[PDB]
Amino acid sequence: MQRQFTSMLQPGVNKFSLRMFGSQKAVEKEQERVKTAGFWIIHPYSDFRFYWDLIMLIMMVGNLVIIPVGITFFTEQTTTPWIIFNVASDTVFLLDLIMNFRTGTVNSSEIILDPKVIKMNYLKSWFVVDFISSIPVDYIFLIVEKGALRIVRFTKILSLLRLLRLSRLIRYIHQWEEIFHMTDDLASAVVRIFNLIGMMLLLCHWDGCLQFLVPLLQDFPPDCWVSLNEMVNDSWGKQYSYALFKAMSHMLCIGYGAQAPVSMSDLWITMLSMIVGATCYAMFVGHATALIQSLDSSRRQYQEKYKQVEQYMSFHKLPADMRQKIHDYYEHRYQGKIFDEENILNELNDPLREEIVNFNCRKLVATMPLFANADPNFVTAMLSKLRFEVFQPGDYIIREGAVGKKMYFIQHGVAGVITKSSKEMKLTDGSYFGEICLLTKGRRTASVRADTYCRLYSLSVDNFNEVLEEYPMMRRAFETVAIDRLDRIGKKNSILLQKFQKDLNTGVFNNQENEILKQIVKHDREMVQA
Amino acid sequence: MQRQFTSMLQPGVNKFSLRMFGSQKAVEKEQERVKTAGFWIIHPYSDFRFYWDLIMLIMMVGNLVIIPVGITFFTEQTTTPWIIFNVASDTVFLLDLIMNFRTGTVNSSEIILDPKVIKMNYLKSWFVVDFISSIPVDYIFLIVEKGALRIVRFTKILSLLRLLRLSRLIRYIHQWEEIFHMTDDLASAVVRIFNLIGMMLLLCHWDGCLQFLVPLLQDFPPDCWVSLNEMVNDSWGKQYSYALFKAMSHMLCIGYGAQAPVSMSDLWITMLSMIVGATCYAMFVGHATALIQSLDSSRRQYQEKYKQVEQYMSFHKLPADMRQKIHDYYEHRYQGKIFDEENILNELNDPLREEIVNFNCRKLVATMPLFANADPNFVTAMLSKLRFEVFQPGDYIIREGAVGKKMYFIQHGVAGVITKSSKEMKLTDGSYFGEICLLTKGRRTASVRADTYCRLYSLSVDNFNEVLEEYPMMRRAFETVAIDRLDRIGKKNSILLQKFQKDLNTGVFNNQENEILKQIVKHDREMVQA
Amino acid sequence: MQRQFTSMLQPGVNKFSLRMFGSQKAVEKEQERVKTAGFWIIHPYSDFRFYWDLIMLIMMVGNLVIIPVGITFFTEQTTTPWIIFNVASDTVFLLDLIMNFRTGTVNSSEIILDPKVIKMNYLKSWFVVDFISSIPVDYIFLIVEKGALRIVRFTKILSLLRLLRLSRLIRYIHQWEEIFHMTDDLASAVVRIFNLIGMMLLLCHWDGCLQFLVPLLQDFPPDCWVSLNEMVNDSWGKQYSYALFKAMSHMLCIGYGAQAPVSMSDLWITMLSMIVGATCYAMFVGHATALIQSLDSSRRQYQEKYKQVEQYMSFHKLPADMRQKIHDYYEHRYQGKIFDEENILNELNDPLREEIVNFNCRKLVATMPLFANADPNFVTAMLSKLRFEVFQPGDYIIREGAVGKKMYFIQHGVAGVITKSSKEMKLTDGSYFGEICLLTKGRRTASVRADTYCRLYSLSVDNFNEVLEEYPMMRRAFETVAIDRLDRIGKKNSILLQKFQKDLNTGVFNNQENEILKQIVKHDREMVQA
Numbered sequence A, B, C: 001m002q003r004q005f006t007s008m009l010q011p012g013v014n015k016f017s018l019r020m021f022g023s024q025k026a027v028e029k030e031q032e033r034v035k036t037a038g039f040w041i042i043h044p045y046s047d048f049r050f051y052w053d054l055i056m057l058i059m060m061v062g063n064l065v066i067i068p069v070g071i072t073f074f075t076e077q078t079t080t081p082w083i084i085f086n087v088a089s090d091t092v093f094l095l096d097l098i099m100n101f102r103t104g105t106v107n108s109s110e111i112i113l114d115p116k117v118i119k120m121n122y123l124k125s126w127f128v129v130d131f132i133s134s135i136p137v138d139y140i141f142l143i144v145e146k147g148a149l150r151i152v153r154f155t156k157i158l159s160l161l162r163l164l165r166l167s168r169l170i171r172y173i174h175q176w177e178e179i180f181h182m183t184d185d186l187a188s189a190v191v192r193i194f195n196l197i198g199m200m201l202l203l204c205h206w207d208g209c210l211q212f213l214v215p216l217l218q219d220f221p222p223d224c225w226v227s228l229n230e231m232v233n234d235s236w237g238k239q240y241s242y243a244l245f246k247a248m249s250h251m252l253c254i255g256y257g258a259q260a261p262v263s264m265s266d267l268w269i270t271m272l273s274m275i276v277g278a279t280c281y282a283m284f285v286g287h288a289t290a291l292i293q294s295l296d297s298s299r300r301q302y303q304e305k306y307k308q309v310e311q312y313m314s315f316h317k318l319p320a321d322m323r324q325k326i327h328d329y330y331e332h333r334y335q336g337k338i339f340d341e342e343n344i345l346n347e348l349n350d351p352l353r354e355e356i357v358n359f360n361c362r363k364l365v366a367t368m369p370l371f372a373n374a375d376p377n378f379v380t381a382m383l384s385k386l387r388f389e390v391f392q393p394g395d396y397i398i399r400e401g402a403v404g405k406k407m408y409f410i411q412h413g414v415a416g417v418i419t420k421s422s423k424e425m426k427l428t429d430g431s432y433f434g435e436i437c438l439l440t441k442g443r444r445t446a447s448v449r450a451d452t453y454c455r456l457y458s459l460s461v462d463n464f465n466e467v468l469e470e471y472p473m474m475r476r477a478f479e480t481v482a483i484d485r486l487d488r489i490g491k492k493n494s495i496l497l498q499k500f501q502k503d504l505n506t507g508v509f510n511n512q513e514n515e516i517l518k519q520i521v522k523h524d525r526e527m528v529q530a
C-alpha cells in the first residue's frame, strides 16, 4: 500500500510529463529525485496532486455557493446539520493547507527542497490568505466571548472570512485549465467562455447575498428596500429570489429592483454594485470578441492574401480578362487554403520529408516504369528534388527552340506534344517530357500545349545533373528512351547517337539491362499511344 | 547646497537617460550643455523635473476631486479654512507656471534655448490655458465688484475655471506613464485600465456636481428634481450621494434617478450626460478588448501556425496515421512554443551567439573527449556551425549506401547502428556518427536507426570541410577513430588506410599526440560498449 | 471669364492629381482630354467639382437638420418664410442633379463619354433616388388636389420624401473623406469617430421627430404619450425637447420616457427605435475598438517581439544572468523601436541609399583622414558596404590567433587593443582595426576588448577585397599604415614587408602620395596616442 502511495506521490509518465521532460530517462530521474526524501514529498505533476486539486476544486465551488447564502438568510445558524457541514469543510481545508506545506513548486527546475526553500516561499506567498480562510474563526471568537446582539452581528460578519477560500480556486484553476485545455481550438474556447460566465454568476450570487446582508445587519430600518417591499416575513426562497433579481438587474444594468433606493446604505451599495457590473460586463464583451476573432482566423487570412493580390492587379491596371484567369489559377492551385509550403517542409526533418513526398507521389512511382524498376535510394533523391505546378488549359508549357532548363512529370490531366509534320501526340497521367533537352544541352525539340487542367511535377536541371551524375544507369535508360522518342518524332540528335554507339559497344550493358530497356521502351510506346 | 541644486537640475544617469543617450559621454555632454546657462535651466529628464511632476500630479488630483464639490454644495464659501486652501493651491500652481517657463522641451535634440525659443514656444502653446487656471479670478472679480445675488451666482460660476487645471494633468501623465510604464506586459496594462477607470470616476464625480449645480443657480425652481424629491433641506452628504447616483445612473445608462425629468434644464442636462456616458463606456469597452487581445497573444499565434499546418495536411489529404506523427513531431520539437530561431540568432552579435551556443552545448563539450581536449577556437567554430534536430522513434537517420552529406552529434536518446553480420551497437548521449563518409567522400557504411526519441546536433559537409581544413590535427584524430571503428565494424577503407600510413610514417605525430589518440580510442571503445 | 471656367472644369495639378497621374504630362493629357468636348464637361478631380461637393454638403446637412423638425412641430407650414426656404433648397438640388448629369465618373480610366455612357450609367444608377428628393412633390400634389384633413395629413407625409437627400450626402462624403483624410493617423481617426457620432446624433434627431410625428397624424388620441403627459398645448421647444429626450433614451437604452407605452402605435415605434439604437450603439463600440487598436500598434508589436525572444530564452532554459545581458543588448541596440532595416534599405533606390548612408556616417568620413582624402566614388562604395553593430562592455571583439573575416570602424565608445608585452592601447571614435589580417590573409595579430559600450561599423572581407581590387591606391595606404602599426606593436609580417619593398621601389609612389601617407601615419600616431 505504501509502495502505491510512493508511486502516486512520484511523477508519473503522462503527456504533460513527456512534454515537460523530453525523454523517459528524465522521468526516471525525477522519480529518483522525489525518492530522495522520505515518505513526505509530492510532486506538482503527480496524479496525487492532480486528484487533490480536483477534489478541492469541487469542494471549493460547493462551499462558495453555499456559504454566503447560509450566512444572510439563516438567522438560526447553530443547528447540528449546519455545524457538521462547517467543521467538515473546515477540516478538509486544513488538510489542504498542510498538503500546501508538503507540496513543491517549479520556478527553471522543479524545487523539491522541503524544510527551508518551499517552506519559506509558501510562508512568504499565501499563508496569511489561506490561514484566515481555513480555521473556523466564528466558533473561536464565540467561545472567547462566552468565556449580545452586537456579538450576534459580529458572528454573522466573520463567517464571510471564508470567502477568502476564493483565491485557492483561481490559483488551482490556473494549473488545471492549462493542463486540461491544451487539446483543441473549440474546446479551449468553450471552456474559457463558460469559465467566465461561471465567474459572472458567482459574482451575481455574492452580490445578491450582499443586498440582503446589509439591510439585515441594521435590523431592517423602516426605509430600506426590504421593509419598503414588506418582505421581512416572507419565506427565504422569496427573499433570496428577490435579492438575486435585484443584484442581477444592477449587474446587467437593466434597472433598479424598486423604483429607487432611498436610504443611504442602499444607495451606496447600489452604486458599488453598478460599477462592478459594468466592469464585469465590459470584460465579458472583450472575451467574446477575442473568442470570435480566434474562431474566424483562417478565412480572414485568406481574404488578406486575396486583397493583396487584388491590390497588385489594381496597381498594374490589368484588364479584367486577365484578372479572371489569375483568380481562376489561384482557385485551381490553392483551393482556398492558405499555407506556406517551403517553410513547413523546411521545418520538418529528413524522414518526415521523405515519407510525405512518397505519399504525395505514390501514384507516379507506380505508373512510371522507371520509378518502379529503379533503386529506392535514387528514387528517393529524385523524388525529394521535385516541385509542384498547376497549368491552366491551353497555354504552352514548353515552346520549341528555346533554351531548356527543367523537365516535367505529368501527374494529372492530359497534355499534348505539337510537332510540325506530326499530327498530335497526347500524354496521359504518368509520363515525362524534357528528357532530351537536358541530355543534349540544346534547344527544345517540339512544343507542348496543356490541353486539360494539368497538375505537373517539375525538376530543375542542376538537381537532375547531380542525381544523374550520382547514378548513371538511369542516364543510360533516359538516353535510350529519348533515342526512341526522337526517332518517332522525326528529328535526330547525333550527339546522343554517338554517345550511345560508344556506350552500347563498350559492353557495359547487360542482358537484364537491355531486357529492362526493351520493357521500358515498349511501355513508352504504350503511354504515347494512350 | 547650490551645487546639489545644480546637480539636481542637470540630467542624471538613469535607465531612461542611457536609453536616450547611448554612452555616458553623452550624459556628460548633456551635463555641460545644461551647465552653459546660469542658475536657471532645468532639463526635462532631471530628477527635479520628475519630482516636480509627481508633486504637481498629487496636488492636481487632490484639487480636481475637491474643487467642484466645494463649489456646489458649500453656499458659505468665504470661510477662513476654505480661503487658506484656495490660496495655497493658487500659489502652488503659480509656482508650477513659472517653472513651466523655466523648463525645456525636446523636439531631434533637447532644446535648451531659454529667452527666445522655449519662451516663444510655451507662450504660443499653453499659456492661456494655464494662466486662466492659475490665479484665483474669483477674488479679483469680487474685489473689483466691491470696489447682489447675480454677483453671488457669478462668483459661484468662475471657480469652475480652475477645472482647466485638468490639461496639465494629462500633459504630465503622458511623460510620467511613458517613463514608469515601460517595464512589463501586466503592469503597463493594469496601470492603463486603472488610468481609464480613474478618468471615468472623475467624470462621474464632475457630472454629479453638475446635476446639482444647475438647479442651484436657478435657486431651486419648483419643478426640478431637487424640489420634487424635496431635498433642499437635507444635509450635504445626502445631496451629494443622490447627485452622484443620478449621474452614475445616466453614465452607465441604467435609468433616470427620478421617474422622469420634467423641467427643460434637467431635460437637456440629462441628454448631454447620456451622450457623454455612452461615449465613455464605448471607449472603456474598446480598451478592455485591446487589453485582452494583448494578453492573449502567444497562444493565439501558436494556434495560427497550427491551423496553417492543418490546412496543409488537409490540402494534400494525408491519412490520419501521418497527421498523428506530424503533430507528435511538432509537440516533441517546439514544445508548444512559437519562436523563430534563425532570425533571433541573426539579430544577435558574435559573442552573444558564442555564449548561447556554449550554454546549449555545455554537456556535449564535456562528454565528448575530443571537445574536452581540443583547442577552444576550433571548438568554438565547430560549435557555431551546428544545427538542432529531433528524430522520432524508429526511423532511419542514415541509410546504408546513400551519398553522405552531414554528420550528427547525439545529445539525447540512444540510437543504434544496424550493420549486417553485426548484432547491433547502441550509442548513448555524447557520441557522433558520420565521420568516415565525410572523410572518405563515399557511400555510407552502415545504417542507423533511431531507437528512442533522439535529439541530435547535425553539421553539414561544407562547414566540416572548412573547419577541418583550417585545423588538421582534429582531422588526424577523426581519421584514427574512424580507422578503429571501421576495423570493429568489418569493412575497411584503403583510401584512409593509405592516407594514414603515409601520414603516420611522415613523423608529424608526437608522443603527446598518440597518447591523446590512445585515450580517445579507448574512450570510443567505452562509449560504443556503453 | 470663360477661360477661367474652362480651367476650373479641367483637372488641376494637385497632390491627389499627381498621385493619380504620375507625371505632369498625364495632367496635360487629361487637360486636353477634357478640352475635347465643348463647354460642358467637368472632371471628377476638378476644383469645380470639389467646391460643388462642399457647397452641396453644407446645404445637405443644413436641410437634413431643419427638414424633419419643420414638418412635425410646425402645423402652419404655408408661411412665406418657409416656402422661400423650400423653393431655395429645391432649385439648389435641381442644380445639383443637372450637374450630376454633366459630371463624369471613373471606373480603369476616367470615363468622359457624355451623351451615351455616363448618361446611361447615371440613369441606371441613382436617378430615381435623386429625382424623388429633388423637386417639391408637396406643392405639385397640393395644386393637383386643388385643381380635407386627410389631404393635410398627406401633405405632411410627403415632405419626408426629402429625407432621400441623405444618399447624396454619404455618396459625396465617400469621395470627400478619401480626399481630405489621407494625411495622418490621428486626424483620420478623429474625423472618422466624429463622422460616426454625427451620424448617431442625426439618427437621434430623426427619431425624435418621428416619436411626435406619429401621435400627430392620428390627431393625438387620448392614450398616446403626448396626451398622457398633457403637452399638446406646450410650446414647440418643450415638445421637441421631450421628443428628443425620449428618442435618446430609447437609443442608448436607458429607459422609457414615460413609465411605459400603452397604445399600440407607441408600442411598436418604441420597439423599432430600440432595435435601431442597439444596432447603432454596437457599431459605435466596434469603431471605438478599431480606433483604439489602430492607435496602439507600435507598442503592441514591440511587445510581440519581446515575448518571442522571451519564449526562446525560456525554451533553452538560459540563466537569468544571461537574460539580463540579452535584454540589455536589445535595449542598447534597438532603443525600443521595432523596425526592419534590410527590407527598407532594399525598398529604397540607389541615391536614396547613398544619401542615407552618407548622413549616418557623416562623422566618420570627417574624423578618419583616409575618408577625408580619398576619392568620393571609392568613399561611396566603401560606405555602401557597411553594417551596424553594438558591443556591450567587456567582451572580446577580435581574439588573437583566430581566422580573420571582417574589419571594424569605430563610431562610438573606446575599445582597447590588448597585446602581450604591450601595456594597452586605447582607440577613440574614428579609427579602424582589422587591416592587417585581411591584407596578409592570416591570423589575428592581437586581441581587442570592448571597454565602453561600442557602436561599431563592420565591413566583410569579400566586399573589402572587391573595393580594394577596384582601386589599389587605398590598398597602398592601408599597407603603409599597417606596416607602421605592426612595427609599433612588435610583430612583423614579411609578406607585406616584401610586397611594399617591391611596391615602393617600383616607382609607382609620388611626392603627393607619400606626403599624404606621412600625414596619414602621423594622424594614426595621434589617434593611437589619443
Ligand SMILES: Nc1ncnc2c1ncn2[C@@H]1O[C@@H]2COP(=O)(O)O[C@H]2[C@H]1O
Binding pocket: A398, A404, A417, A425, A427, A432, A433, A434, A435, A436, A437, A438, A443, A444, A445, A446, A447, A448, A485, A486, A488, A489, A528
Ligand atoms: N513523340 C513524342 N511523344 C511524347 N513526347 C515527346 C515526343 N517527342 C518529343 N517529346 C518530348 O517533348 C519534349 C520537348 O522538347 P525537349 O527537347 O524538352 O524533349 C522533348 C521530349 O521529352
Ligand SMILES: Nc1ncnc2c1ncn2[C@@H]1O[C@@H]2COP(=O)(O)O[C@H]2[C@H]1O
Binding pocket: B398, B404, B417, B425, B427, B432, B433, B434, B435, B436, B437, B438, B443, B444, B445, B446, B447, B448, B485, B486, B488, B489, B528
Ligand atoms: N561499430 C560502430 N559503432 C558506432 N558507430 C559506427 C560503427 N560503425 C560505423 N559507425 C558510424 O555509423 C556511420 C554510418 O556511416 P558513415 O559512413 O556515415 O560513418 C559511420 C560511422 O560514423
Ligand SMILES: Nc1ncnc2c1ncn2[C@@H]1O[C@@H]2COP(=O)(O)O[C@H]2[C@H]1O
Binding pocket: C398, C404, C417, C425, C427, C432, C433, C434, C435, C436, C437, C438, C443, C444, C445, C446, C447, C448, C485, C486, C488, C489, C528
Ligand atoms: N598598436 C596598435 N594600435 C591600434 N591598433 C592595433 C595595434 N596593433 C594592432 N592593431 C589592430 O588590431 C587588429 C587585430 O588583429 P588584425 O590582424 O585584425 O589587425 C590588427 C590591427 O588592425
